[PDB]
Design a protein around this ligand. Structure first.
Ligand SMILES: CC(=O)C1=C(O)CCCC1=O
Ligand SMILES: O=C(O)CCC(=O)C(=O)O
Ligand SMILES: [Co+2]
Length: 347
């Protein structure tokens, strides 16, 4: 009935909607870059966590973060029965009757929007184009601030399995941080002090099939605002596209592997040594696509700016140092917009 309450896309697709409603249809300029992406000209960066202390993988990790901003993590310790469980339980929640799922809506009373809960992202203006997907957005860290009213009670083991999966990726977070601290020549607890009691979120994305996969986005082109993201996809058939130098490339998170991409917070803190990739998801006609992304932010203690240990005489500050409040407002507000916030920091 109004633009502040957008529809659940899964139920639109399940209805057999003849064509995407105008609220999801892209403009002419945006539609010439999405229907076709190229393949990776260079093979996909892969890192083995079991030998990440070795000198060969560190060079592989450095090349990944400096040339692409993302990499596939293999041999990560997280058991496959756990990765399948958290994915299967996510699928069972999305396949519940809609009236059960609206109890966990992110529109409080069906009216006032908030981030946490089941739905889509914030609709700022009436003519804002919506993504062709829904997501279940939940806070996982710190545990004390967890709102269990939004954690699905059915299937009954969702809360325990998510809690168990989150602790496993948090340890992966700390192992990737220690390795990145060695590539930058910085001390470990520079990041850990900023990760202490820091926010972390779990985003369950559901990408329904679309009747016109050439007119919509599953998720808008964007870069994450976190420090970095740990992504898990359920039998990825395709859809994720990453941008480099204006050119879009297809990337496929193979099963049992975790994709880890850097966010905008890391690019500023490492003074642009490593990059934060702009990425998107495109739909297709037949099959739905489910992914879970673990987003790890920094706390609110230190300003968002290049690490002082990285600003020697040969390489000065390439970004401005900004307060944390001013940073999160820019990231949160520019997600629905075309321009990218972090570019305004470049000096
Ligand atoms: C933490 C933040 O970076 C993320 C969410 O807000 C929405 C999904 C994409 C990403 O931008
Ligand atoms: O669905 C994907 O493959 C990417 C996930 C993503 O971009 C996000 O949730 O921020
Ligand atoms: Co993303």
């Amino acid at each position: 009935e109004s633009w502040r309450t957008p529809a659940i896309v899964q139920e639109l697709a399940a209805a057999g909607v003849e064509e995407p409603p105008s609220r999801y249809v892209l403009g002419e300029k945006d539609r010439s870059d999405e229907l076709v992406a190229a393949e990776l000209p260079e093979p996909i960066p892969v890192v083995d966590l079991s030998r990440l202390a070795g000198a060969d993988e560190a060079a592989k990790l450095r090349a990944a973060l400096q040339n692409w901003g993302f990499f596939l993590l293999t041999n990560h310790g997280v058991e496959t029965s756990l990765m399948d469980d958290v994915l299967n339980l996510a699928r069972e929640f999305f396949n519940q009757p809609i009236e059960r799922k609206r109890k966990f809506s992110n529109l409080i009373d069906g009216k006032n929007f908030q981030v946490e809960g089941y739905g889509t992202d914030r609709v700022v203006t009436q003519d804002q184009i919506l993504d062709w997907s829904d997501r279940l957005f939940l806070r996982v860290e710190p545990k004390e601030e967890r709102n269990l009213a939004f954690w699905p009670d059915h299937p009954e083991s969702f809360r325990d399995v998510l809690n168990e999966y989150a602790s496993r990726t948090k340890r992966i977070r700390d192992d990737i941080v220690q390795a990145m601290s060695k590539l930058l020549g910085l001390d470990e607890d520079y990041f850990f002090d900023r990760l202490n009691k820091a926010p972390a979120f779990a985003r369950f994305n559901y990408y329904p099939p679309c009747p016109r996969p050439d007119l919509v986005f599953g998720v808008r082109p964007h870069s994450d605002g976190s420090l970095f993201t740990i992504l898990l996809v359920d039998e990825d058939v395709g859809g994720l596209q990453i941008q480099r130098d204006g050119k879009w490339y297809n990337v496929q998170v193979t099963p049992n592997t975790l994709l880890i991409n850097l966010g905008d917070t890391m690019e500023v803190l490492c003074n642009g040594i490593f990059r934060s990739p702009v990425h998107r998801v495109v739909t297709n006609a037949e099959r739905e696509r489910i992914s879970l992304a673990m987003l790890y932010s920094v706390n609110d203690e230190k300003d968002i700016g290049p690490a002082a240990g990285l600003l020697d005489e040969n390489r000065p500050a390439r970004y401005r140092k900004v307060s944390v409040g001013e940073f999160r407002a820019g990231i949160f507000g520019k997600f629905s917009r075309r321009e990218r916030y972090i570019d305004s920091l470049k000096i």
